[PDB]
Amino acid sequence: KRKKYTLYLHPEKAADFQTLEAIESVPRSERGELFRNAFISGMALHQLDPRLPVLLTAILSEEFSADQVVTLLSQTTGWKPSQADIRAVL
Amino acid sequence: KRKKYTLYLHPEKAADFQTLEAIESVPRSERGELFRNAFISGMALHQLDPRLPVLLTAILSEEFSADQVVTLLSQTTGWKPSQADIRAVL
DSSP states (O other): OOEEEEEEOOOOOOOOOOOOOHHHHOHHHHHHHHHHHHHHHHHHHHHHHHHHHHHHHHSSTTTTTTHHHHHHHHHOOOOOOOOOOOSSOO | OOOOEEEEEOOTTTHHHHHHHHHTTTTHHHHHHHHHHHHHHHHHHHHHHHHHHHHHHHHHTTTTOOOHHHHHOOOOOOOOOHHHHHHHHH
């Protein structure tokens, strides 16, 4: 068994175009597994809050960073630091 | 140039199954735009660190949380809160 999914990107938009470059630097053999994981985590973000996947898409750029994902995660989810290095005791 | 991508999920697995349900509760009409966003942001995560999209897929459960994403993010990127601690201390 295995469900098949089809989707389309628009190479004119910067995010789409940038995604296309990231994919082509991944050997075809390894892509089916890449797509699955990208799609699952993408949909995971969606389950966290439906705006997230469209937000990450919209913000995507060469400056993309983990930070952008966290603050974006804060704004959408209310997520706030719960733990932190203990050295950071001021 | 509307590029097209084909990917496969595996209902037999928890993560894939949990993803199917998410898709299901989204009207067919909207799924096309939902798939692109989930895909692009999934690949955005890939660009941050290739292990990320497979770490999220792997951890995926009904307890998925922003907090889990931030964690995998730091364990995989080096991201850490900042003076954003002084805040939480309130």
